[PDB]
RNA sequence: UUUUU
RNA sequence: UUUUU
RNA sequence: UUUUU
RNA sequence: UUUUU
RNA sequence: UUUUU
């Protein structure tokens, strides 16, 4: 289960 | 009688004894495929996430929805237990993708969110949260008790009757209103007017007519 | 164009023949999707889509019958309308247009489902209307002897 | 004279996307599916939804 | 530009603590959660929620 | 019926049977477990208490 | 007659 | 159809 | 979801 | 009719 | 469109 950024990109 | 136009059959007879929807891929209820198509294609690309480790973090996304509701309100992070820690998914991309709204998208989880509350109930009682709310008390019917319930034809009668209680209990005479401030905001034009070191006032140029009498 | 009007009536059994129909309207060729464009029939339905949809009826009512003969095939409209017959499922579709070669217990099942479906509905005639200039034009000539921009020039101020 | 070639063009681009046009983001309207009518030059025609007018 | 950079960052801050930006604090709004769009230079994409409009 | 996107499968199924979130740990009634627990720091943090006491 | 998505 | 957090 | 002092 | 950035 | 410190 992946852990996830909040900025992370592709955006 | 099958209907006329300029004397010529307006219907294929051939194709219609050949023709089987199954009544779920037709509906209006449930979105359409190339829209779900696009919302799973659009919050796969918002979480950077791979085509293998998608399908669990629907299998989360599943459950919350089941607890909680599938309003366009939702907003916030979504919890999914990895083992006995939490991961917080971002709600953004999925209310913001979902193209007619977000119950029409999670309506193809609808039966096996369905199945899904009778695994469960299985191991131990197992009632959703929208269930919860609504005060449901018969607790067989809590298989049916979730937020975005698909009614198909092959559902019992009473399943109908608890489902459309719950949302009749629901919606409580939602006023539906369309309009809200438009950004329009200036009411008032433009003071165009030269200011002159001439003038006498800000707001006035020259008595004129004053008389001193 | 019968294919597509076969689709057509299908997805009018599930889904209402109201006027208030936008979207797309979905036909099952084999196991994908195409979706069509609403736009045309509610445009081009003169009267309204209800009676150029009742020329479908006895078509659409026999079609319910053929589903029926497979499988439970209950349309979209009875299960919003919560008909718990099953076997009234060949009269409960939106369009029906009431023969008078029909069961009286049909009668009273479609009127049942329209009196349900409508609820006081009261039919509006008018909303606002696009002449949305209230007030009249300012044709009044501005110019550099005047006194303020809605003001000539004061006449009567005695300064006392 | 673009009205309805525009009028498909929201339909067009909301066929893949959430495409609301910036005037009706500026006006507020809360629908969504009436998008395809909220723009600034729209043509109102007598083939047109009694909603949408 | 920075629209939608600084409404993911609102969000990053409010994981940790209660971050309300200043200009939410003037406008006196009581919600909390849409301190995430009660910034100054918010842009209003189609993509965003009509409670947030 | 199982949902498609482009003729895949969205769901896993062999997840779906090894999944036991115990129905507390995912609502929204109950705040998350950061949020607890940074809560929990910082009322400690403002009151200067040792972590047994 | 219209109003049943 | 939308409105059920 | 928030609103229960 | 014009006035909707 | 500008005007939100």
């Given at each position: 289960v992946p852990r996830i950024k909040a900025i992370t990109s592709k955006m | 009688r099958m209907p006329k136009s300029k004397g010529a059959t307006v219907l294929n007879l051939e194709h219609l004894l050949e023709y089987?929807?199954?009544?779920?891929?037709?509906?209006?209820?449930r979105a359409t495929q190339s829209q779900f198509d696009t919302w799973y294609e659009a919050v796969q690309l918002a979480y950077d996430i791979g085509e293998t480790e998608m399908p669990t973090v629907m299998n989360g996304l599943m459950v919350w929805c089941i607890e909680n509701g599938t309003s366009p309100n939702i907003n916030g992070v979504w919890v999914m237990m990895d083992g006995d820690e939490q991961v917080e998914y971002p709600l953004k991309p999925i209310v913001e993708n979902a193209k007619p709204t977000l119950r029409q998208i999670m309506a193809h989880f609808s039966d096996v969110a369905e199945a899904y509350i009778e695994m469960r109930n299985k191991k131990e009682p197992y009632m959703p949260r929208y269930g919860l709310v609504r005060n449901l008390?018969?607790?067989?019917?809590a298989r049916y008790a979730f937020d975005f319930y698909e009614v198909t034809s092959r559902t019992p009668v009473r399943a109908r009757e608890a489902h459309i209680q719950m949302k009749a209990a629901a919606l409580?005479?939602?006023?539906?209103?369309?309009?809200?401030?438009?950004?329009?905001?200036?009411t008032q034009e433009e003071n165009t007017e030269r200011h002159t070191?001439?003038?006498?006032?800000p707001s006035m140029h020259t008595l004129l007519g004053v008389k001193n009498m």
């Open positions: - | 089987a929807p199954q009544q779920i891929d037709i509906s209006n209820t008390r018969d607790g067989s019917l409580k005479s939602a006023q539906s209103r369309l309009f809200g401030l438009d950004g329009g905001i200036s070191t001439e003038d006498v006032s």
